[PDB]
């Protein structure tokens, strides 16, 4: 099955998921000189005060922080979006070294990691229905650079030792995702896809301009996770990013001048 190695990584995914070669794949390189300012775009509304995290999971690719999405508790609206999108999970992509790890790039610059906050359009009732629609998901993408520690990340880092290997989960209640956001909500937006199989072309991407800072020690803990299951040969969970895909017939729009 799919992964990030030489024999199962991104260049192979098209054989089981032919949309990998589709017209609206993600991630992409954001060329800052050609993204146009769109004064028609709104400020993004991120309303995470009532978010209810439940659990953290090592799914063998990354780890997922899961939320209760059975009510409008943690929602994204505004920006480029019509209607209301409910938070279901967040996860990260990261590198073996600080010079790689992000999925999106900015003028070909790779960040050390990228955080994806995944939200589904409430008009489709559930996540599984949403991913079948071109406007089903909104993903907030946030770059990570290595510098100062991010205090709001430490609770996640703390728990990783308990979910080392594929299939392990742990209770992860009362975690506040607001502590993962940068100061500014300036963004770029474009239509794309999930960045892991099944690569469905159901996402409005909202990529924040301002990265967050995390410490080297925080990142290093991500790189101690394992892609393998318990008692199998150790293969460090690093370099779990898909490279940039062709932009094709798309425009990237900027919320800011």
Per-domain residue ranges for the chain? Answer: 1-257
User: Omega of the bond prior to 180 within 30 degrees of 0, cis?
Assistant: no
Tokens of 152: 């709001």
User: Active site includes 12?
Assistant: no
Residue 186 is classified by DSSP as -
Euclidean distance between the first and final Cα of the chain, in Å?
A: 44
195: annotated binding-site residue? yes
Cα–Cα distances (Å) from 34 to 28, 30, 53, 104, 256, in that order, read 13, 8, 38, 15, 13
- DSSP SS3 for 127: helix
Distance CA 254, CA 234 (A): 42
Torsion, CA 57, CA 14, CA 127, CA 167, rounded to 10: -20
Distance CA 122, CA 119 (A): 9
CB atoms within 10 A of CB 1: 6
Please count the residues of the chain: 257
Helix or strand run (H / E) with residue 106: strand 105-106
CB atoms within 10 A of CB 60: 19
Bridge partners of 208?
187
CB-count exposure of residue 170 (10 Å: 0-12, 13-18, 19+): middle
Residue 1 is classified by DSSP as -
Residue 240, Cα to own-chain centre: how many angstroms? Answer: 11
Helix or strand run (H / E) with residue 91: strand 85-94
Catalytic residue among 33, 61, 104, 119: 61
Tokens of 75: 């929602």
Distance CA 241, CA 144 (A): 13
91: annotated binding-site residue? yes
Resolution for this experimental structure (Å): 1.2
- The candidate with the shortest Cα–Cα distance to 234, out of 225, 242, 243, is 225
Query: What is the DSSP code string of 16-77?
Result: H-GGGGSSS-S--EE-TTTSEE-TTPPPEEEE-TT--EEEEEE-SSSEEEEE--SSS-SEEE
189: annotated binding-site residue? no
Q: Which residues contact 233 (CB under 8 A, 6 or more apart)?
A: none
Return the HEC string of 128-184.
Answer: HHHCCCCCCEEEEEEEEEECCCCHHHHHHHHHHHHHCCCCCEEECCCCCHHHHCCCC
Residue 249 is classified by DSSP as S
Specify the experimental method. Answer: X-ray
Assigned fold of 1-257: Carbonic Anhydrase II (3.10.200)
- The candidate with the shortest Cα–Cα distance to 96, out of 243, 244, 237, 242, is 237
Q: Look up tokens 């299939």; give the residue.
A: 167
Positive or negative torsion for Cα 242, 81, 126, 65: positive
Cα–Cα distances (Å) from 116 to 1, 15, 34, 40, 78, in that order, read 23, 25, 24, 25, 18
Mark 217-226 as b/e (b = at least 16 C-beta within 10 Å): ebbebbbebb
Cα–Cα distances (Å) from 157 to 116, 153, 224, in that order, read 16, 6, 11
């Amino acid at each position: 099955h799919w992964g990030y190695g030489k024999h199962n990584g991104p260049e192979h995914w098209h054989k089981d998921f032919p949309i990998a070669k589709g017209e609206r794949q993600s991630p992409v390189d954001i060329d800052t000189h050609t993204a146009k300012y769109d004064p028609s775009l709104k400020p993004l509304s991120v309303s995470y005060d009532q978010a209810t995290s439940l659990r953290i999971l090592n799914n063998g690719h990354a780890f997922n922080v899961e939320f209760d999405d059975s009510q409008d508790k943690a929602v994204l609206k505004g920006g480029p979006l019509d209607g209301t999108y409910r938070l279901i999970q967040f996860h990260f992509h990261w590198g073996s070294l600080d010079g790689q790890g992000s999925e999106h790039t900015v003028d070909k610059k790779k960040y050390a990691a990228e955080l994806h906050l995944v939200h589904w359009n409430t008009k489709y009732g559930d996540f599984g229905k949403a991913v079948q629609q071109p406007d089903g998901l909104a993903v907030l993408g946030i770059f990570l650079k290595v510098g100062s520690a991010k205090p709001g990340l430490q609770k996640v880092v703390d728990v990783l030792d308990s979910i080392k290997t594929k299939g392990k989960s742990a209770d992860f209640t009362n975690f506040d995702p607001r502590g993962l956001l940068p100061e500014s909500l300036d963004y770029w937006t474009y239509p794309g896809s999930l960045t892991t199989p099944p690569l469905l072309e159901c996402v409005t991407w909202i990529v924040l301009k301002e990265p967050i800072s995390v410490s080297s020690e925080q990142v290093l803990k991500f790189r101690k996770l394992n892609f393998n299951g318990e008692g199998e040969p150790e293969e460090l969970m690093v370099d779990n990013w898909r490279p940039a895909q062709p932009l094709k017939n798309r425009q990237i729009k900027a919320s800011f001048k």
